[PDB]
Amino acid sequence: QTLRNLLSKVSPSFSAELKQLNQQYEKLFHKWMLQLHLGFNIVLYGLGSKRDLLERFRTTMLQDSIHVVINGFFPGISVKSVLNSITEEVLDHMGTFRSILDQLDWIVNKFKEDSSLELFLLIHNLDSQMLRGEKSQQIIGQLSSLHNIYLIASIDHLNAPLMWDHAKQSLFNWLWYETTTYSPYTEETSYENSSSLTHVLRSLTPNARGIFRLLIKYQLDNGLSFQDFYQQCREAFLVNSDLTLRAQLTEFRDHKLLLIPVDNGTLTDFLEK
Amino acid sequence: LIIAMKHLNDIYEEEPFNFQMVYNEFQKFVQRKAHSVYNFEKPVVMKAFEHLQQLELIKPMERTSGNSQREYQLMKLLLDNTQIMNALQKYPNCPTDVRQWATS
DNA sequence: GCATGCATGCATGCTGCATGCATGCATGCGCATGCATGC
DNA sequence: GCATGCATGCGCATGCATGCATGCAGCATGCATGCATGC
């Protein structure tokens, strides 16, 4: 999958229609801002990567106000991290919190006491694996229930409507907009995690390399019993005592290398290489 | 209910059971008899079963809740046939019909 | 001599029974962390 | 103000329960074949 890094040389097709499509999409920003500012939260749904449109909207209209961007497609994001970021910067508070619910209570009380605070949220790929928790969406909806917070979200998964319940629907107060941009999902697939054997075996002792080669050969022929494997290793004179063979087996185990959990085709290609 | 449970344990050798089978065979017993005064509905029998389980004469297997209701739950009896017979012999006012059903 | 009807043995299709293996789920344990308290 | 010890929350491994399939053997049934028997 390393070849992916070199695959970016392919040129796009029919880019003129995409240009007109983006120009048509650009004109809805004022209406979206008006709908946000009256107490509505907006979801964007449609085919194609819509990150570019959101970034354009931010850099065009949100350069004069406080705004927080969370690109949830990163698999390391959690709601507690968002809460900590809000507390540390929006309110500039450093004190730790005993529980998530207590942090939510503090934030709600602070925002209710201070009516001069306005915050904008820009969430990318709200359907992330880490944000699908019921408590996560409950927390986000409770946050969005305030009249001093504006929410723009994006949907890219098919089963998104199952996330929201009737009470959650009432809390979120959603409006929908269809914006299909046809953009490739380069960045959003970049962080996602869908050679090693050669590098490991390069610096290992040649006896271990031969033993592993024999093990691969037997595995491709048809798991070995310990006794038969020891006898065959004896026959090749790569082992002088069973303690040494078990030491080599433990060395292989330490690298997570009896069955080898490696695909047959990869082993066949590696043997000749 | 206990006599019905004993009959279930005899017919199905050492197997669990639920509320529905016991209710069905109790209904069979009260329907075979012409007009005996045992016309009871589901909720009262359910409450009686709950009380029996509360007294810890019946214990669940592989306890779980939510996934399985009180109904359709695998129950087992914690008594022996000779104990039931001896206790029934000393029952003060056991009716004839229930005694003969127990013997059958 | 032969055709027809009847009786029977066999092939086969259906179905009921016996069973192990993969996987999901609950649980117990054990470790990391934040808080109450004491000095 | 600090250290410490305790209560709590979460991750991980494990054992067990559940679903799911397939091959075999027995049985019933319908058909092919042999036998009797008259005209």
Side-chain angles (χ1 to χ4, degrees):
Chain A
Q1 301 202 5
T2 56
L3 278 184
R4 281 192 185 142
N5 292 343
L6 285 175
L7 303 186
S8 62
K9 293 180 182 179
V10 184
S11 56
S13 300
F14 302 104
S15 61
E17 296 80 3
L18 280 72
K19 290 188 286 290
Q20 290 88 61
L21 183 63
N22 295 116
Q23 297 295 322
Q24 295 294 322
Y25 285 145
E26 283 189 359
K27 65 181 73 174
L28 295 170
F29 294 162
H30 268 277
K31 189 175 179 181
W32 292 355
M33 294 177 77
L34 182 62
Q35 289 173 345
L36 289 171
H37 183 74
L38 295 170
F40 291 112
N41 305 320
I42 296 89
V43 162
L44 294 175
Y45 75 105
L47 182 59
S49 174
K50 65 180 72 66
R51 179 179 180 271
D52 281 16
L53 183 62
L54 293 174
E55 184 177 1
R56 265 307 302 290
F57 167 52
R58 189 186 79 99
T59 189
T60 294
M61 297 298 177
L62 275 295
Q63 291 187 171
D64 316 322
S65 51
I66 303 164
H67 58 278
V68 176
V69 182
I70 301 299
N71 56 3
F73 77 115
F74 174 61
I77 302 180
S78 69
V79 290
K80 68 93 180 179
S81 176
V82 178
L83 296 177
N84 292 118
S85 298
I86 294 166
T87 51
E88 63 86 19
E89 183 148 322
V90 178
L91 297 171
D92 214 9
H93 180 61
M94 190 62 203
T96 68
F97 272 101
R98 305 194 277 256
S99 177
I100 287 171
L101 282 72
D102 186 73
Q103 187 171 208
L104 296 173
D105 296 330
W106 184 66
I107 294 165
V108 168
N109 210 8
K110 181 56 58 66
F111 263 87
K112 266 303 310 174
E113 281 196 58
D114 290 336
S115 50
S116 60
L117 277 295
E118 299 175 355
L119 182 60
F120 289 65
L121 275 295
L122 296 178
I123 299 173
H124 286 75
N125 189 359
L126 190 63
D127 299 328
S128 75
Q129 315 322 313
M130 299 294 93
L131 291 173
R132 285 183 196 181
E134 305 157 314
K135 290 180 72 68
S136 164
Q137 314 286 359
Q138 206 294 325
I139 290 168
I140 297 169
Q142 183 95 9
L143 261 176
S144 64
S145 66
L146 293 171
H147 78 289
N148 292 340
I149 300 178
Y150 312 106
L151 183 62
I152 296 296
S154 67
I155 292 172
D156 291 331
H157 188 275
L158 184 65
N159 294 338
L162 285 171
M163 297 298 291
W164 287 272
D165 190 359
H166 269 76
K168 293 186 183 93
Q169 277 192 350
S170 178
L171 294 174
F172 276 109
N173 200 16
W174 285 125
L175 276 296
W176 305 64
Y177 282 98
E178 182 179 1
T179 51
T180 61
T181 51
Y182 266 110
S183 186
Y185 297 97
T186 55
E187 311 155 299
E188 296 170 5
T189 49
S190 69
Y191 275 132
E192 171 66 29
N193 293 336
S194 199
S195 177
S196 77
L197 195 69
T198 308
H199 286 105
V200 169
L201 282 158
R202 183 84 49 65
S203 58
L204 288 170
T205 186
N207 289 346
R209 185 178 65 247
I211 292 167
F212 197 69
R213 184 274 305 160
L214 172 142
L215 184 65
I216 289 171
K217 275 295 303 301
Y218 187 103
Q219 173 143 358
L220 281 171
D221 289 342
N222 62 5
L224 281 172
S225 58
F226 184 71
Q227 296 184 348
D228 186 73
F229 181 61
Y230 181 78
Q231 286 290 106
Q232 291 189 20
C233 289
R234 197 209 64 164
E235 286 167 3
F237 297 107
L238 289 169
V239 184
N240 298 333
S241 177
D242 49 332
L243 194 145
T244 76
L245 182 69
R246 286 189 177 254
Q248 314 324 306
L249 286 173
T250 53
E251 279 169 44
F252 286 141
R253 182 182 72 164
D254 287 344
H255 310 64
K256 294 304 191 133
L257 291 171
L258 304 173
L259 190 78
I260 303 172
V262 177
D263 186 39
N264 311 346
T266 54
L267 294 175
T268 57
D269 297 344
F270 168 77
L271 189 150
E272 54 89 18
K273 288 170 189 171
Chain B
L1 280 167
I2 281 160
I3 292 157
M5 201 155 288
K6 177 162 67 64
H7 287 326
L8 290 200
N9 276 304
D10 280 24
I11 296 151
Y12 305 145
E13 192 72 23
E14 206 186 321
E15 280 170 319
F17 44 84
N18 56 59
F19 182 80
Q20 295 281 354
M21 288 186 278
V22 176
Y23 179 76
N24 279 123
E25 276 156 283
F26 171 73
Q27 275 302 307
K28 186 183 291 183
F29 158 82
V30 294
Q31 280 163 337
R32 281 197 192 153
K33 315 311 165 166
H35 301 291
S36 53
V37 187
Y38 300 97
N39 297 3
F40 300 130
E41 305 202 323
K42 194 89 156 185
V44 293
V45 183
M46 178 65 171
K47 296 301 183 183
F49 199 87
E50 287 179 347
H51 182 60
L52 282 182
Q53 197 262 0
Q54 190 164 359
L55 305 176
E56 288 207 18
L57 299 175
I58 303 168
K59 68 101 175 181
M61 304 189 81
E62 185 66 14
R63 198 209 80 77
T64 194
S65 54
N67 273 357
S68 51
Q69 298 168 247
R70 290 163 201 142
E71 303 184 5
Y72 297 115
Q73 194 67 79
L74 298 175
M75 298 282 114
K76 287 184 66 67
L77 188 57
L78 304 176
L79 278 179
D80 199 342
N81 311 291
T82 185
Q83 289 176 279
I84 309 153
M85 301 321 294
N86 275 15
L88 195 141
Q89 278 153 21
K90 286 193 302 179
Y91 203 100
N93 304 282
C94 46
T96 49
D97 297 21
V98 67
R99 269 192 42 72
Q100 281 155 99
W101 178 29
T103 60
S104 63

